[PDB]
Write an enzyme that holds these catalytic residues in place. Sequence first.
Site, mmCIF file in Angstrom:
data_model
loop_
_atom_site.group_PDB
_atom_site.id
_atom_site.type_symbol
_atom_site.label_atom_id
_atom_site.label_comp_id
_atom_site.label_asym_id
_atom_site.label_seq_id
_atom_site.Cartn_x
_atom_site.Cartn_y
_atom_site.Cartn_z
ATOM 1 N N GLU A 106 0.820 -1.209 0.000
ATOM 2 C CA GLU A 106 0.000 0.000 0.000
ATOM 3 C C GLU A 106 0.859 1.267 0.000
ATOM 4 O O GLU A 106 0.796 2.068 0.932
ATOM 5 C CB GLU A 106 -1.019 -0.048 1.147
ATOM 6 C CG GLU A 106 -1.947 -1.256 1.007
ATOM 7 C CD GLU A 106 -3.162 -1.337 1.916
ATOM 8 O OE1 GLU A 106 -3.219 -0.564 2.893
ATOM 9 O OE2 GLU A 106 -4.065 -2.175 1.629
ATOM 10 N N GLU A 114 -4.380 -9.011 -1.016
ATOM 11 C CA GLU A 114 -4.835 -8.776 0.353
ATOM 12 C C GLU A 114 -6.322 -8.431 0.372
ATOM 13 O O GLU A 114 -6.770 -7.534 -0.333
ATOM 14 C CB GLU A 114 -4.067 -7.631 1.031
ATOM 15 C CG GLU A 114 -4.261 -7.582 2.547
ATOM 16 C CD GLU A 114 -3.676 -6.334 3.206
ATOM 17 O OE1 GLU A 114 -2.491 -6.030 2.936
ATOM 18 O OE2 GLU A 114 -4.393 -5.686 4.025
ATOM 19 N N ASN A 123 -12.981 -10.949 -9.556
ATOM 20 C CA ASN A 123 -11.564 -10.935 -9.911
ATOM 21 C C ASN A 123 -11.264 -11.915 -11.050
ATOM 22 O O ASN A 123 -10.620 -11.540 -12.029
ATOM 23 C CB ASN A 123 -10.672 -11.163 -8.686
ATOM 24 C CG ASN A 123 -10.442 -9.902 -7.878
ATOM 25 O OD1 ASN A 123 -9.546 -9.113 -8.167
ATOM 26 N ND2 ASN A 123 -11.208 -9.738 -6.815
ATOM 27 N N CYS A 156 -9.684 -8.522 3.559
ATOM 28 C CA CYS A 156 -10.330 -8.960 4.785
ATOM 29 C C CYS A 156 -11.552 -8.082 5.015
ATOM 30 O O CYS A 156 -11.573 -6.929 4.570
ATOM 31 C CB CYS A 156 -9.420 -8.877 6.007
ATOM 32 S SG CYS A 156 -8.838 -7.203 6.411
HETATM 33 C C1 LIG Z 1 -4.411 -4.346 4.320
HETATM 34 C C2 LIG Z 1 -5.645 -4.058 5.154
HETATM 35 C C3 LIG Z 1 -5.618 -4.115 6.495
HETATM 36 C C4 LIG Z 1 -4.343 -3.923 7.284
HETATM 37 O O1 LIG Z 1 -4.392 -4.701 8.490
HETATM 38 C C5 LIG Z 1 -3.130 -4.269 6.428
HETATM 39 O O2 LIG Z 1 -1.958 -3.831 7.096
HETATM 40 C C6 LIG Z 1 -3.284 -3.612 5.049
HETATM 41 O O3 LIG Z 1 -2.090 -3.722 4.303
#
Ligand SMILES: *[C@H]1CC[C@@H](O)[C@H](O)[C@H]1O
EC number: 3.2.1.45
Length: 497
Positions: free
Chosen positions: A235, A340, A370, A342
């Site tokens: 990020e 990534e 995706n 969640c």
């Molecule tokens: C992805 C989203 C949540 C964070 O916990 C993580 O560090 C980020 O890179």
Amino acid sequence: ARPCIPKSFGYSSVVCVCNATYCDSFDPPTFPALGTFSRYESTRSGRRMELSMGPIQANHTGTGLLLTLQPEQKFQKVKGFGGAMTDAAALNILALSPPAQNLLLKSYFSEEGIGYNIIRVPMASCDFSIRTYTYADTPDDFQLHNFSLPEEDTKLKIPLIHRALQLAQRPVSLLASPWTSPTWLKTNGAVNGKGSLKGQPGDIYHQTWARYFVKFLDAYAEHKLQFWAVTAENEPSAGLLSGYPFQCLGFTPEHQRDFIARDLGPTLANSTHHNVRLLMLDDQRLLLPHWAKVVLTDPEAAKYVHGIAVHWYLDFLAPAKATLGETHRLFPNTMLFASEACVGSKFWEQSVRLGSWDRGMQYSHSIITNLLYHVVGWTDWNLALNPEGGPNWVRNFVDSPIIVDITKDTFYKQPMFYHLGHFSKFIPEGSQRVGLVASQKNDLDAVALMHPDGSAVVVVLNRSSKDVPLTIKDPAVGFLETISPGYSIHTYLWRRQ
Ligand SMILES: *[C@H]1CC[C@@H](O)[C@H](O)[C@H]1O
Ligand SMILES: *[C@@H]1O[C@H](CO)[C@@H](O[C@@H]2O[C@H](CO)[C@@H](O[C@@H]3O[C@H](CO[C@H]4O[C@H](CO)[C@@H](O)[C@H](O)[C@@H]4O)[C@@H](O)[C@H](O)[C@@H]3O)[C@H](O)[C@H]2NC(C)=O)[C@H](O)[C@H]1NC(C)=O
Ligand SMILES: *[C@@H]1O[C@H](CO)[C@@H](O)[C@H](O)[C@H]1NC(C)=O
Ligand SMILES: *[C@@H]1O[C@H](CO)[C@@H](O)[C@H](O)[C@H]1NC(C)=O
Ligand SMILES: O[C@H]1[C@H](O)[C@@H](Cl)C=C[C@@H]1O
Ligand code: NA
Ligand code: NA
């Protein structure tokens, strides 16, 4: 082979309860005999990848929904699916008794589980750590003489990765990503907040940072672990934001372009790790196609970039066609990879919602979308969290497919686990996405793949409340008459020859 032990926590579905002496398990995947199909079904009502079989019919008549396989029409090849071995995940796993640990690892990594083949590995600390550290915290150590792996790696993460590899029958690919550099390389001299590397690409700060990647790979290699890929930074857009709360390192796309071209690309290329792939972006898809254009239109950067890693957090305001689709169009030979995801990170989301069917559907809907837009793989975040969604040094708690309840020496496998497994178990590396076209407008999400051996795999998600009767047509083979029950997910398997 062993059924789910269901428990409700008052949300829309059940978790499956595992402990030192019991965990639900599957059989290794197999295709059934030609002329027969397999169906694996999970439902809100509590079915957990239940196997049933049916006949393939020569003919079909009627006005109901028809999904027609287009097996000749080929898209992307699949790299795989997995999750992240954060400090938090490692701590949660190792807090279980050894027998329980083994059942958790098997859940993810064995063919009696969901056959993960990717592990994302943070390079030193992130928010999902209980300690802030890098591998080179001794100030002004430009030579990196004091670079070293702490116990988080040597005692926690590395041994767990080795255990996962022992259980996995499929080759596992490791992916490394850094959150922050040593603070003495940074404009702000802190792990968090608005701050980038000091100076400019091609200089001592940037050369040192690139060498840190090699030192990391050297150290893991000493521990008998090799990497498939690294990203250029987790990020990079985060470190551009005033007051960013946890570990980050800011790059504009121009900065990333120049860092890759001048420092990271040449450094890796001139190392024993030259075969390790480099993925750019590792950030929200809202930044595409812009970021891909900036980096990949420069030949000196482009020659080092294998792929574009994407995170899911802004998908809700970044339509796939305009981002993934457009990026694939402009740069069809540069793979897209989801690195990534969640639930729980958003302001309006509670961290953990034990048994949430909604969060399961979010996972499967994301994976399908995706896959329909050229992405070759999909990676979860923390492999396991506690019931608070931690630990996490800034208390940035989130959800995880497995939640560990140390007091009860128990872990709970949530809908998210099964939703991910509907893909991971049945889609080996090298599977290829093929066409699948609907006869009429419908509320289903569906994707078709061709297994390496030529067999068909179709995943159908119904996020609506209504049962949808449908037929799948394979032009060479015949028709599958089936139903997509409301709030269900199915994986269909069948041989074509
Ligand atoms: C992805 C989203 C949540 C964070 O916990 C993580 O560090 C980020 O890179
Ligand atoms: C680890 O998890 C295991 C599974 O949850 C635990 O075993 C369970 O322990 C409870 C409490 O002793 C038992 O519950 C009883 O169940 C019987 C009915 O049992 C049988 O039928 C059910 C159908 O639901 C089936 O699941 C079982 O396999 C049995 O054949 C009731 O009559 C009792 O009133 C009471 O509810 C479970 O039987 C038992 N399950 C299993 C699979 O063995 C185990 O205790 C946990 N271990 C630790 C260390 O905590
Ligand atoms: C299927 O369709 C063909 C062509 O109309 C026909 O010959 C056949 O009898 C039909 N029925 C079965 C059971 O194959
Ligand atoms: C850093 O490494 C150098 C060279 O190995 C060594 O002399 C020194 O003691 C180390 N310093 C720290 C803080 O470990
Ligand atoms: O549970 C059912 C499923 O819902 C339908 Cl589609 C067919 C077979 C299974 O036994
Ligand atoms: Na293995
Ligand atoms: Na939240």
